């Protein structure tokens, strides 16, 4: 029927499988390295996308 096919594209999967996986490449920009505070616990420096 027209309406459902309009929004949701058909994707046939054989009954031998059980799902489909998405492997996404993503390019990043990030600064430096986790610098010592001479302490026990550390935060991670945010790794940021380039499209943003």
């Amino acid at each position: 029927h027209e309406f459902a096919e309009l929004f949701y594209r058909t994707y046939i999967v054989t009954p031998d499988q059980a799902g489909f996986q998405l492997s996404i490449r993503r390019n990043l920009v990030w600064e430096g390295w986790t610098g010592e505070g001479l302490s026990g616990e550390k935060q991670e420096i945010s790794k940021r996308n380039i499209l943003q």
Binding site: L38, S39, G40, E41
Partner: protein
């Protein structure tokens, strides 16, 4: 060294926990349960303990 297993072999790649007083005590178990056990690692002398 053919007759001893201490002549060769050394661990300079092990990432063994090391204790520093007043800096990372919140990561190691309280020393009121089990005192720290000294370890020999290369040329270094330091104390290690279980991770809480």
């Amino acid at each position: 060294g053919l007759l001893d297993y201490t002549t060769l072999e050394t661990n300079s790649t092990e990432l063994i926990p090391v204790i520093q007083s007043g800096e990372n005590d919140e990561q190691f178990i309280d020393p009121s349960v089990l005192p720290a056990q000294t370890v020999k690692q290369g040329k270094d002398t330091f104390d290690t303990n279980f991770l809480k």
